[PDB]
Every structure is written in structure tokens, then in C-alpha cells.
Amino acid sequence: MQGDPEVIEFLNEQLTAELTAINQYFLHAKLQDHKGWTKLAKYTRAESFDEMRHAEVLTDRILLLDGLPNYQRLFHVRVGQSVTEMFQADREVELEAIDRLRRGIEVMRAKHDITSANVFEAILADEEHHIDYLETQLDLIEKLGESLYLSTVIEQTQPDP
Amino acid sequence: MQGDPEVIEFLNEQLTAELTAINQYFLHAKLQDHKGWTKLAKYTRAESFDEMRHAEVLTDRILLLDGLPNYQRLFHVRVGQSVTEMFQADREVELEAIDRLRRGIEVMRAKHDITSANVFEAILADEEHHIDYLETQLDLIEKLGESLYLSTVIEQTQPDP
Amino acid sequence: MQGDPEVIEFLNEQLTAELTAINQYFLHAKLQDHKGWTKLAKYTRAESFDEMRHAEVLTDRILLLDGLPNYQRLFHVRVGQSVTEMFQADREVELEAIDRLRRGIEVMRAKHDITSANVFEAILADEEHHIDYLETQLDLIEKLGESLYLSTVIEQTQPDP
Amino acid sequence: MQGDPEVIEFLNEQLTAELTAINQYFLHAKLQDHKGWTKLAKYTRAESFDEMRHAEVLTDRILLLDGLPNYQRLFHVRVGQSVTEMFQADREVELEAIDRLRRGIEVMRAKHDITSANVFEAILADEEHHIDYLETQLDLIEKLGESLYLSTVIEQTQPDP
Amino acid sequence: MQGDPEVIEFLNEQLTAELTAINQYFLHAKLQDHKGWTKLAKYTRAESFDEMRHAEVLTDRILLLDGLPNYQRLFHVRVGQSVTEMFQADREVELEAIDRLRRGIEVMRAKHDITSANVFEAILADEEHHIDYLETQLDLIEKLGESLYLSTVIEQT
Amino acid sequence: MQGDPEVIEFLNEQLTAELTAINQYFLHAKLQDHKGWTKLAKYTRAESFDEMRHAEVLTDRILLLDGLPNYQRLFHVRVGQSVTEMFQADREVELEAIDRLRRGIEVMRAKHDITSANVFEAILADEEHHIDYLETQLDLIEKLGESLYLSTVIEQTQPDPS
Ligand code: HEM
Ligand code: HEM
Ligand code: HEM
Ligand SMILES: [Fe+2]
Ligand SMILES: [Fe+2]
Ligand SMILES: [Fe+2]
Ligand SMILES: [Fe+2]
Ligand SMILES: [Fe+2]
Ligand SMILES: [Fe+2]
Numbered sequence: 001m002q003g004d005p006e007v008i009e010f011l012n013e014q015l016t017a018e019l020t021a022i023n024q025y026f027l028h029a030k031l032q033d034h035k036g037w038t039k040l041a042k043y044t045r046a047e048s049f050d051e052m053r054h055a056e057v058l059t060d061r062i063l064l065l066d067g068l069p070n071y072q073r074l075f076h077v078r079v080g081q082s083v084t085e086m087f088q089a090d091r092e093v094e095l096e097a098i099d100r101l102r103r104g105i106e107v108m109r110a111k112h113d114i115t116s117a118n119v120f121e122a123i124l125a126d127e128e129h130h131i132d133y134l135e136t137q138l139d140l141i142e143k144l145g146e147s148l149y150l151s152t153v154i155e156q157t158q159p160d161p
Numbered sequence: 162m163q164g165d166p167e168v169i170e171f172l173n174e175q176l177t178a179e180l181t182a183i184n185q186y187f188l189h190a191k192l193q194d195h196k197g198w199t200k201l202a203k204y205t206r207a208e209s210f211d212e213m214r215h216a217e218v219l220t221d222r223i224l225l226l227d228g229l230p231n232y233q234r235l236f237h238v239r240v241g242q243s244v245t246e247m248f249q250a251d252r253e254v255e256l257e258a259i260d261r262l263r264r265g266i267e268v269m270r271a272k273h274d275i276t277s278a279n280v281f282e283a284i285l286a287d288e289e290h291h292i293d294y295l296e297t298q299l300d301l302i303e304k305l306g307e308s309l310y311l312s313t314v315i316e317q318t319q320p321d322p
Numbered sequence: 323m324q325g326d327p328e329v330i331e332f333l334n335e336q337l338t339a340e341l342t343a344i345n346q347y348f349l350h351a352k353l354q355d356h357k358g359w360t361k362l363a364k365y366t367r368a369e370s371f372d373e374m375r376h377a378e379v380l381t382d383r384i385l386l387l388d389g390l391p392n393y394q395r396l397f398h399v400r401v402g403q404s405v406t407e408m409f410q411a412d413r414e415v416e417l418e419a420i421d422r423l424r425r426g427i428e429v430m431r432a433k434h435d436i437t438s439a440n441v442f443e444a445i446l447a448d449e450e451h452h453i454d455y456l457e458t459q460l461d462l463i464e465k466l467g468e469s470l471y472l473s474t475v476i477e478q479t480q481p482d483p
Numbered sequence: 484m485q486g487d488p489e490v491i492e493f494l495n496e497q498l499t500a501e502l503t504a505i506n507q508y509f510l511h512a513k514l515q516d517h518k519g520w521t522k523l524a525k526y527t528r529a530e531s532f533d534e535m536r537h538a539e540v541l542t543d544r545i546l547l548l549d550g551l552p553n554y555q556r557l558f559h560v561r562v563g564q565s566v567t568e569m570f571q572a573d574r575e576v577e578l579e580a581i582d583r584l585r586r587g588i589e590v591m592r593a594k595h596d597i598t599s600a601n602v603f604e605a606i607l608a609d610e611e612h613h614i615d616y617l618e619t620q621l622d623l624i625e626k627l628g629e630s631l632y633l634s635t636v637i638e639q640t641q642p643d644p
Numbered sequence: 645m646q647g648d649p650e651v652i653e654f655l656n657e658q659l660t661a662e663l664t665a666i667n668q669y670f671l672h673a674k675l676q677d678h679k680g681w682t683k684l685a686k687y688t689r690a691e692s693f694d695e696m697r698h699a700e701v702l703t704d705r706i707l708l709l710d711g712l713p714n715y716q717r718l719f720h721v722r723v724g725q726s727v728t729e730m731f732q733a734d735r736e737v738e739l740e741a742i743d744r745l746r747r748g749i750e751v752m753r754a755k756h757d758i759t760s761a762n763v764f765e766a767i768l769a770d771e772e773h774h775i776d777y778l779e780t781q782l783d784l785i786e787k788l789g790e791s792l793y794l795s796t797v798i799e800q801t
Numbered sequence: 802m803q804g805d806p807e808v809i810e811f812l813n814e815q816l817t818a819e820l821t822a823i824n825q826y827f828l829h830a831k832l833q834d835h836k837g838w839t840k841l842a843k844y845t846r847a848e849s850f851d852e853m854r855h856a857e858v859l860t861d862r863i864l865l866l867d868g869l870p871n872y873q874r875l876f877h878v879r880v881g882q883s884v885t886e887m888f889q890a891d892r893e894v895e896l897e898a899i900d901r902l903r904r905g906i907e908v909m910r911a912k913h914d915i916t917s918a919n920v921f922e923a924i925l926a927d928e929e930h931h932i933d934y935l936e937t938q939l940d941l942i943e944k945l946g947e948s949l950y951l952s953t954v955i956e957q958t959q960p961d962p963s
Binding site: 034035036147150151154156158159160 | 200201203204290293294297298300301304305306309310312313314
Binding site: 023024027030031034059064074160161 | 507509510540546547555557559
């Protein structure tokens with residue numbers, strides 16, 4: 001087996017994207033936890049781990065076709081300081097990823113490579129779920145009031161580690 | 162073994178400081194608990210116990226060098242009535258302690274007494290953690306709003322004992 | 323409720339006394355343990371803990387009447403080198419305390435404040451028991467012989483942590 | 484608290500180095516596992532996890548001093564095809580790291596910041612252990628014979644997930 | 645890795661000292677146990693085992709720097725007949741060891757080798773504890789009375 | 802009772818020999834373990850512990866006769882680099898010990914001291930078994946091939962405590 005060049009290019013793009021996402025999510029997890037906001041920290045940690053698993057699967061697949069994984073690149077990382085900005089950054093990233101996934105699935109399945117298409121389909125479902133949750137939380141913050149919102153996710157524990 | 166005079170002087174200063182801190186923390190624990198604020202009471206109580214253990218370790222050490230522990234002194238104790246004032250008092254105390262610890266560690270380790278230096282290093286780490294937590298809580302109170310902050314740490318139980 | 327000034331004065335004096343006692347007992351516990359006499363260390367440590375509990379109860383009561391606890395003042399602390407001197411110091415302290423307790427209970431119960439009177443009565447019973455035990459041990463030391471007495475409370479641990 | 488600029492610079496450099504190491508180790512884990520050499524895969528995977536933990540600790544510390552972690556930069560990643568080349572790459576990386584650690588510990592502890600010095604000391608111990616193991620395995624491969632060496636770490640699983 | 649010569653010299657001296665201490669402590673354990681004083685035999689055995697562990701750690705460290713451990717040389721061993729003499733011998737040994745440890749830690753940490761300095765720091769803490777206990781027991785023997793002291797550690801079994 | 806002088810001399814010599822053996826075996830255990838060879842390390846550690854127990858028994862006996870144990874003297878310690886040299890050193894030591902044990906047992910039992918003779922007999926049995934195992938392993942190394950031999954006792958831990 002030898003996957004064509006274009007399939008490998010798409011797989012590499014998606015791999016780099018998932019890596020960037022891992023980095024962003026972990027940085028945000030630490031930043032949030034340090035300030036007192038706890039449950040947000042727990043949620044964001046879980047999401048980072050999920051993106052890790054994604055990266056693993058893509059790496060294996062791109063190995064099995066006689067490819068050269070690219071663990072040397074990275075797209076721009078964004079960082080915020082309030083809550084609204086964090087959520088907006090994450091929403092932007094997920095949108096871009098979804099568009100790429102769709103285009104890639106089309107081109108792939110038009111060339112008789114089915115397994116890669118299935119991998120992309122799974123990734124796509126998950127990214128859609130995630131963007132949905134982000135949008136919901138953003139709408140709440142808009143409605144209640146930033147102080148009100150924050151006042152529900154603070155507990156008494158040790159900030160630093 | 163006979164630790165030099167200056168080492169003993171520094172150990173005695175630190176001992177007196179830890180004693181003062183114990184007293185302040187327990188008074189604040191009672192005052193907070195009596196008004197309804199519960200979780201604050203639990204936290205402050207635990208912190209007082211920790212400072213107790215600190216004092217014990219310092220006493221044992223200063224005994225092992227043929228010294229004369231000083232259980233007769235006390236630095237000025239501060240007391241507030243609101244929350245912000247309590248937190249600010251505690252922050253002031255911790256700052257003073259940290260500065261003393263650093264100067265003492267330097268002078269000690271410049272005279273071939275290593276064990277005392279290690280004791281001071283441990284104490285220093287812990288005091289740093291504590292000051293960090295204090296600053297975080299103070300920032301929250303500044304942001305949310307005093308009443309809207311308190312409204313998260315009140316339960317239905319027996320005030321007095 | 324607002325307890326009169328005189329009731330609060332008596333409560334404050336008793337509080338300061340129990341604090342001084344806590345300090346003295348703990349210092350003696352360390353000093354005894356460091357020399358090898360363990361079985362005395364255990365007893366004295368337990369007694370210190372009991373006096374701690376005393377202080378806590380008194381503080382709560384003096385809070386419930388709209389008072390101002392006084393955690394800033396200490397009486398004189400005594401320290402002895404041999405054993406007989408330790409026991410004699412403790413006996414002196416307990417005697418002073420008992421006299422104060424009796425006078426206070428009388429004046430209180432002559433003014434329609436019954437709960438404080440009950441608190442004092444409990445404290446009085448306990449401090450009397452303690453003075454009794456002290457006197458007994460002192461009589462033994464007088465009879466047997468100092469060295470022949472010590473020879474019964476030494477074990478093979480000889481610590482100083 | 485506000486750590487000086489130079490302390491933060493050293494912490495940031497060490498953080499970037501640990502990140503690069505994580506990436507290299509995991510790529511090597513996958514590459515080895517895919518070819519049949521199992522036990523080497525297990526070992527290298529565990530080492531990657533350890534470096535992950537290192538990175539986390541450094542990030543927290545650099546946060547506590549009011550710093551700006553740098554999750555956006557990577558050094559050069561090396562990849563080899565045979566086994567000897569893998570081991571040699573890892574050895575090179577560890578050497579660079581050790582030199583940096585020593586210089587940094589000196590400069591730090593010459594400026595009254597002790598906790599960062601302790602962090603570096605722990606990291607240094609661990610990196611030394613690791614370089615030792617690498618050198619040992621390389622010497623064996625040199626002695627036995629490459630094929631006769633590999634023949635000891637192959638099992639009947641031959642997966643690639 | 646290539647540890648300098650002077651670091652290795654200090655490590656070797658400390659190793660030889662710990663070995664001598666092991667030998668002395670075990671001989672004393674047997675001698676005491678044989679006469680009836682059991683409760684002292686137990687303590688002394690435990691201390692010998694601790695010194696064994698010390699020796700092991702030092703040997704490994706001096707191996708990791710490309711060194712040549714020296715398991716061929718011993719210092720002088722002392723032996724006493726009564727009890728006070730045993731305690732005094734042990735006290736002397738520990739004092740000497742402590743002085744060496746301090747000087748070595750200084751010179752080491754002045755040359756960027758940190759892990760060895762940490763090893764020495766741990767050893768130093770432990771030796772200090774031990775010398776303390778020795779001094780305490782000696783003071784008791786001085787106070788109570790030799791026979792009246794012994795009479796508390798004999799056992800019919 | 803008081804054992805004669807010559808009995809005590811023989812007991813002291815044997816004690817010194819067992820001490821030297823303890824030292825050699827532990828040094829070899831560390832050296833082997835540090836290079837990767839594991840199972841050899843485990844075996845050699847066990848052997849060192851056995852020699853320790855030997856020394857303990859001998860010292861107790863020499864005390865019970867009103868003697869003066871000699872914890873101050875050591876014979877020469879040998880050290881190698883490869884495997885063959887290690888095994889050959891150990892074989893040499895055991896041979897010497899055997900000869901001494903036999904001569905001593907004879908002289909002892911010719912003087913009405915039976916318990917010491919029994920002690921020596923036990924020690925002798927054990928030393929014989931040990932020398933046997935050494936010779937067997939040496940013959941294997943001769944037959945298979947040094948590298949092809951080592952390739953069977955290496956695992957993926959490669960430690961060196963500190
Ligand atoms: C900056 C910090 C971290 C980075 C850059 C990072 C990155 C990675 C990468 C690149 C992988 C391999 C991708 C793959 O196998 O497909 C991975 C796997 C993994 N990492 Fe990390 N990681 C970080 C922190 C952590 C931490 C602190 C933990 C603590 C447990 C952790 C746990 C894991 C796990 C469990 C996996 C494998 C998940 C699975 O097998 O399903 N990661 N991570
Ligand atoms: C100079 C003043 C004091 C000193 C030196 C002191 C010392 C100590 C020490 C060393 C302990 C050790 C407990 C442990 O190791 O677990 C202790 C326990 C304790 N302290 Fe104090 N203390 C002081 C005053 C107080 C005060 C003012 C209070 C009450 C507000 C208090 C309440 C307690 C209690 C209740 C315990 C035991 C907790 C339990 O048994 O659950 N102490 N103290
Ligand atoms: C370099 C390391 C060691 C050395 C030099 C050493 C040396 C010795 C010596 C000289 C004796 C008894 C000597 C006599 O009876 O006069 C002995 C006995 C003993 N030591 Fe060690 N030892 C070492 C390691 C250890 C370790 C690590 C342990 C425990 C984990 C240990 C436990 C014992 C035991 C159990 C005995 C008695 C053996 C038996 O009853 O058969 N030794 N050792
Ligand atoms: Fe993803
Ligand atoms: Fe403290
Ligand atoms: Fe009392
Ligand atoms: Fe690392
Ligand atoms: Fe030692
Ligand atoms: Fe033997």
C-alpha cells in the first residue's frame with residue numbers, strides 16, 4: 001500500500017491542527033485554574049485530553065500508508081485574559097477545522113480511499129459537538145451577566161500547584 | 162554541638178513570629194464562624210493548625226543545639242471586622258515573614274550550618290503558597306462584589322458552640 | 323443579650339490564665355521528652371491539650387455576650403531545670419487559678435447570669451483533679467528518691483525531633 | 484511577588500526544551516512500535532509521559548511569579564531510521580539540557596530565589612539518570628551485535644494502532 | 645559524564661568511614677547481647693543496618709561518575725569492655741565523620757556538582773541525630789548510676 | 802570452659818576469610834548490575850547474603866569459648882572487568898577456603914572439641930556446592946560464546962540507583 005500524495009497532505013494538515021489545539025487547551029486550563037475558577041478548569045482539561053487522543057489516531061493512520069508525520073510545525077496560538085475572549089478563540093479554531101474536514105472528506109472518498117474517509121467522519125462528528133457546547137456557554141454569559149456567571153464556578157481549594 | 166549565637170537569634174525570631182500567627186488565625190476562625198460564614202471558618206481553622214506544626218518543628222530544632230526557646234514574647238496582633246480587612250492583615254503578616262526567612266537563610270548557609278538552612282527553605286515554600294491564595298481571594302472579592310461574594314459561603318447550621 | 327462589664331472582665335482574666343498554662347505545659351513537654359523521660363512527656367502533652375480545649379470554650383462564651391476576647395496578653399511563664407521544680411511551678415499556677423474561679427463564681431451567680439456560673443463550675447472541678455495528681459507525684463518523689471524515681475520512666479527511644 | 488526578568492527567561496528556555504523533548508520521544512515511540520520492537524516502545528512511551536509531567540510543573544511555577552508562559556516556540560526535532568541513531572539523538576538532547584540546568588541554578592541561587600533553584604535541582608537529578616541509561620544501552624548494542632540485540636525485544640503482536 | 649578527581653576522593657573517604665562504622669557497630673551488638681543486656685543489642689543492630697544502607701548509596705553514586713570504589717581499606721576499629729567506653733567510642737567516631745562531611749559539602753558545591761552535595765546533606769542530618777542520642781544516654785548513665793542503669797535492660801528469655 | 806589457643810586461631814582465620822568473601826561478592830554484584838546484566842546481579846546478591854550469615858555464626862561460636870574476634874584484618878580483594886575474570890576470581894577464593902576447612906577439621910576433632918568440628922563440616926558442604934556451580938557456568942561460557950551467552954541475561958530496566 002502507498003497512499004497518494006494528496007491524501008497524505010490532508011492528513012498532515014489535520015495533524016498539525018490537532019496539535020495546535022492541544023497546546024491552546026492546556027494553556028487555558030492552567031490559566032483558568034490559577035484564578036479560582038475551578039469547574040471550568042476541569043472541563044477544559046478533559047477537552048485537551050480528547051484532542052490528544054485525536055492526534056494519536058491520525059499519527060498512526062498516516063504511518064500505515066508509508067508517510068512522514070510532521071511533528072515540527074505549529075499554527076498560531078491565541079490567548080485571552082477574560083472569559084468571553086477564551087470562548088471566542090476556541091470557537092474560531094473549531095470553525096476552521098470543520099471546514100477543512102469537509103473538503104478533505106470529499107476529495108478523499110472521490111479516490112477510493114475509504115478508511116481515511118471514515119476517520120475524518122468520526123473527527124467531524126466530535127468537533128461539531130464541541131462547537132455546539134461552546135456556543136451555548138457563550139449565550140449564557142451574554143444573558144445572565146459576567147459576575148453572576150462567574151459566581152457559580154468558584155470553590156474553596158488551593159489555586160497554585 | 163553548639164550552634165553559634167546568631168543562628169539561635171534567627172531561630173528565636175522566627176519562632177515568635179509563628180506563635181503570633183497561630184493566635185491571629187484562630188481568633189479569626191472563631192470570629193468568622195460566629196457570623197454565619199462557614200467554609201471560611203473551616204479553611205482558616207486548617208491554616209491555624211498548619212502554623213502550629215511549624216512552631217513545633219522550630220522548637221525541637223532550637224532545642225537540639227543547646228538553646229533557650231522563648232515562649233514568653235509576642236508581636237502585635239491585628240484584628241478586623243469585615244472580610245477585606247481580615248485578608249489584608251493576613252497578607253501583611255506573611256510578607257514580613259518571607260523577608261525575614263530569606264535574609265536568615267543567606268546568613269546561615271554562609272556559616273556551615275546546613276540543617277537549619279533546610280528547615281528555613283521548607284518554611285519558605287509553604288509561606289509563599291499561602292500568600293498566593295490570599296491574593297487570589299482578595300482579587301475575587303474585588304471583582305464580584307462583597308455581598309454577592311459572601312452569598313456563596315453561607316449554610317444552615319449552629320453559629321455558637 | 324449584653325453581659326455586664328464585670329462578667330466580661332472575669333471571663334477575660336480566666337482566658338488569659340488558661341492561655342499561659344497552655345504555653346507552659348507544652349514547653350515542659352518538649353523539655354522532658356528531650357532528656358529521655360518519655361512517660362512523663364506523654365502525660366504532660368495530654369494535659370496541655372486539655373487546657374487548649376478549656377481556652378476554646380471560654381472564648382466562644384465570651385463571644386456570645388457581645389465581648390472582645392483578648393488574645394494579646396500573657397502572664398509570667400515559669401520554667402525549671404530539674405523535675406521537682408517543674409512540679410512545683412505547675413502546682414503554684416493551679417492554686418492561683420482555683421482561687422480566682424471561686425471568687426468569680428460567687429460574684430457571677432449573685433447577678434442572675436447562670437450559664438457562665440456553670441462554665442466556671444466545670445472548669446473548677448477539672449483544675450482541682452489536676453492539682454491533686456500533682457501533689458501525689460511530688461510526695462512519691464519525696465519518698466522513694468529522685469534517681470530511683472526517674473529510673474521507672476525511661477525507655478529506649480531517646481528522640482528529639 | 485514578582486520574579487526578576489532573568490529568572491523568567493531561564494524558566495522559559497527550560498520549558499521550551501522540555502516541550503521539544505516530549506514531541507521527539509513520542510514520535511520515536513510510535514516509529515519503534517510500528518516495526519515490531521515492542522519493549523523499546525513501552526520504555527520510550529513511559530519516558531515521554533515523564534517529560535510531560537516535567538513541563539506541567541515548570542508551567543505552574545512560571546505562572547506563580549506573574550510571568551507569561553511561552554507555548555508557541557519549539558527547538559529542532561531530530562529523527563533517525565535505525566536504532567543507534569535514535570539513541571544518539573536522545574543522548575545529544577539530554578546533554579544540552581544538563582548544561583543549561585547547571586548554569587541556571589548557579590545564577591538563580593545567587594539572587595535569593597530558592598524555590599526555583601530547588602525545582603531545577605530535581606529536574607537535574609532526573610535528567611542525569613536518563614542519560615546514564617541511554618549510554619548503557621548504547622554500549623550493549625555496540626558489544627553484542629545489532630541483529631543479535633534486536634532479537635531479544637520482539638513479540639507476537641506486530642500491531643500498529 | 646566525568647566527575648573530577650577531588651569529588652571522587654571525598655566520596656571514597658566517606659565510603660571507607662561508613663564501612664569501618666558498620667564493622668564496629670556489629671561487633672558491639674554481639675558483645676552486648678552475649679552478656680544479657682538485650683534491649684541495647686536490638687538498638688545497636690538497627691544502627692548497624694542503617695550504616696549498611698548508607699554505604700550502599702555512596703557506592704552506587706561513586707560508580708555513576710566513572711570511579712573506582714575502594715572496598716579494600718579500613719580505618720582503626722575501637723572496642724571497649726564496659727558500657728561507658730562503648731558509648732564514648734561511638735561518639736568519637738560520629739564527631740569525626742561530621743567534620744569531614746561539612747568540609748566536603750562546601751568544596752563540592754563550589755564546583756557545580758550538586759547531586760553529590762545533596763547526598764552529603766542527607767548523610768549529615770542522620771549522623772547529627774545519632775550523636776544526639778548517644779550523648780543523651782551517656783548523661784543518664786552519669787546521673788542514675790551504672791548498676792541501677794543496667795538493671796533496666798536485662799531480660800529472662 | 803576455655804577452648805585451647807589453636808582452635809581459636811583456626812576459627813579466626815576462617816572468620817577473616819568469610820569477611821573478605823562478603824566484600825568481594827557485594828562489589829561484584831554492584832558492578833554487574835550497573836552494566837545491564839541483571840539475573841547475574843540477583844544471584845550474586847543472594848550469595849553475598851549467605852556468606853554474611855556464615856560470618857555471624859562463626860563469630861558467635863568464637864565468643865562462646867572466651868575468645869577475641871578479629872574484625873580488623875582483611876585478605877586481598879580481587880576485581881575483574883569481563884565475566885570470565887569474575888568467575889575465575891571467585892573459583893580461586895573458594896578453592897583456598899576448602900583446603901583450610903579440611904585441615905582445620907582434622908586437627909580440631911583430634912582434640913575432643915566436637916561442636917567446632919560440626920560447624921566446619923556444615924561450612925564445608927556449602928562451599929563445595931558453590932564451587933560446583935561456578936565451574937558449571939564457566940564451562941557454558943566456554944561452549945556457547947561470550948556474546949551469545951550474555952544475550953540471555955539482559956532485561957529492560959538498566960538501572961543505577963544513584
Ligand atoms: C504541554 C503538555 C502536553 C503535551 C504537549 C502533550 C501532548 C501529547 C501528545 C503529542 C501525545 C501523543 C499523541 C498520540 O498518541 O496520538 C499525548 C498523549 C497522551 N498524553 Fe500528553 N501532552 C501534554 C500533557 C499531558 C499530561 C500532563 C498528561 C497527564 C496524564 C498527559 C497524558 C497523556 C495521555 C494519557 C496520552 C495518551 C492518550 C491515549 O492513549 O488515549 N498529557 N500527549
Ligand atoms: C500559644 C498558643 C498555642 C500553642 C503554642 C498551641 C500549640 C498547639 C500544638 C503544638 C498543637 C498540636 C496539634 C497536633 O499536632 O495535631 C495544638 C493543637 C490544638 N490547638 Fe493549640 N496552641 C495554642 C493555642 C490554641 C488556641 C488559642 C486554640 C483555640 C482557638 C487552640 C486549639 C487547639 C486544638 C483544639 C488543638 C487540638 C485539635 C484536635 O484535637 O482536634 N490552641 N496546639
Ligand atoms: C554493602 C552492603 C552490605 C554490607 C557490607 C553488609 C555487611 C554485613 C555484615 C558485615 C554482616 C554481619 C557481620 C557479623 O556478623 O559480624 C551482615 C549481616 C546482615 N546484614 Fe548486611 N551487609 C550489606 C547489605 C545489607 C542489606 C542491604 C541488608 C538488608 C536489606 C542487610 C541485612 C543483613 C542481614 C539480614 C544480616 C544477617 C544475615 C543472616 O542472618 O544470615 N545487609 N551484613
Ligand atoms: Fe480534534
Ligand atoms: Fe508558618
Ligand atoms: Fe484549665
Ligand atoms: Fe525533562
Ligand atoms: Fe553513616
Ligand atoms: Fe562461606
